[PDB]
Every structure is written in structure tokens, then in C-alpha cells.
Amino acid sequence: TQQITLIKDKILSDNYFTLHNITYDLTRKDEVIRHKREVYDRGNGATILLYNTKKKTVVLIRQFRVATWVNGNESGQLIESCAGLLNDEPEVCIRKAAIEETGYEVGEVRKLFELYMSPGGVTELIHFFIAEYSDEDIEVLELPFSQALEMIKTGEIRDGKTVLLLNYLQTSHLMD
């Protein structure tokens, strides 16, 4: 792979987000192979799990996701951690989203990592955060952390980033 030379970037759709057909020469460890790859750029995002160490609860959201609705999610409804697309800086973005989606204006946030979520053909990078909490088309779900972790096992929670956050919180010992 090491040597990469861009040959062509063709826009297949710029309706709002952008789909590309990208051609690049790749030099195999062994030999020059020309790859043609479809790449979808819907920009980057951030997500945040809200947790309360006193009550032992977490705050998640439930909303209709049409992309799950066309792909085996019968009602389209999906339980997720609070998230939003980023022009804002990650921490600026996620503080907006927290107020706008959950109603909590949160103090200190803790950043976990930045992960590409679907690198086969989508650019999307997600900024992951957690925050303590106190005091739309989106339902705010407050639930016991113990119930949320169990919802991962039954398949009631079936969102990538949401599982990643909940597992981090579990491994952090913050709720112990």
C-alpha cells in the first residue's frame, strides 16, 4: 500500500452531502494497482454519554432514524447517546447538542477518543465524550446504567457509538 497517488476524484452527488468516486494508484507490498472507490462524505460528528454517579443513571435519546428504517429497524426508532454533526469545534458542537437534545447544559466533559465509524466507504469520524449531569422529535430516556448495559445484550440498544460509550463508562469504574 505505502505509495498512494491520486488519479481522479469524481463527484457522483453533491445534493447536500457529497459522494465521490476516487481513483488512486496503490503500490502493493509485492505492483501497482489502480483502485476505484466510492466515498461518502457527510462530515464529522460528536457524541456524549450523560451519567449520574449518585442515581446510577444514564441519559440517552430515542428518535426516528430512516437509514435504520429501510434496513430492518421496524419502527425506525433508535436509542442512541446524544450526538450531532460538527462548522463547530467538537466540544462546542457537543455542548450545543446536549442542550438541544437533552435539556442539560453540562459543565465538565471528558473526551475518550476519535474513531472512524464506517471506513469501508464513509469518511465519518466521531468525537466521543462523557459528562456528569444534574438538575423536539427526540425523546429523552433516563434509565438505570444497569438496565442500559442489559439492553446491549437483548439488542434493545444496537447503535455502535452508544455501545462504545456505555462500555467505556462500565470499564471506567465511575459508577462504582
Binding-residue total with Mg ion (CB under 5 A): 2
Whether 97 contacts 89, CB under 8 Å: no
- Name the nearest CA neighbour of 51 among 114, 116, 109, 118: 109
Which residue's CB is nearer to its own copies, number 67 or number 108? 67
Helix (H, G, I), strand (E, B) or coil at 54: coil
Whether 50 contacts 106, CB under 8 Å: yes
Which helix (H) or strand (E) segment is 98 a member of?
none
Which of 9, 14, 25, 38 is in the footprint of Na ion by CB under 5 A?
38
126 touches its own copies by CB under 8 A: yes
Q: Which stretch binds its own copies (CB under 8 A): 49-57, 86-94, 96-104, 108-116?
A: 108-116
The owner of cell 459522494 is 19
Helix (H, G, I), strand (E, B) or coil at 30: coil
Binding-residue total with its own copies (CB under 8 A): 74
Which of 8, 55, 103, 118 is in the footprint of its own copies by CB under 8 A?
118
- Say how far apart CA 7 and CA 24 lie, in whole Å: 5
7 touches its own copies by CB under 8 A: no
- Say how far apart CA 97 and CA 110 lie, in whole Å: 15
- Name the nearest CA neighbour of 121 among 29, 12, 48: 12
Give the per-residue contact string, 67-106, with Mg ion (x = CB under 5 A; - = no).
Answer: ----------------xx----------------------
137 touches Na ion by CB under 5 A: yes
Q: Which stretch binds Na ion (CB under 5 A): 3-11, 61-69, 91-99, 102-110?
A: 61-69
Q: Which stretch binds its own copies (CB under 8 A): 49-57, 86-94, 95-103, 151-159?
A: 151-159
Burial class (CB in 10 A: 0-12, 13-18, 19+), 69: middle
150 touches Na ion by CB under 5 A: no
The nearest distance, CB 23 to Na ion, in angstroms, is 11
Q: Which spans of this chain sit near Na ion (rule: CB under 5 A)?
A: 1, 37-38, 63-64, 120, 137
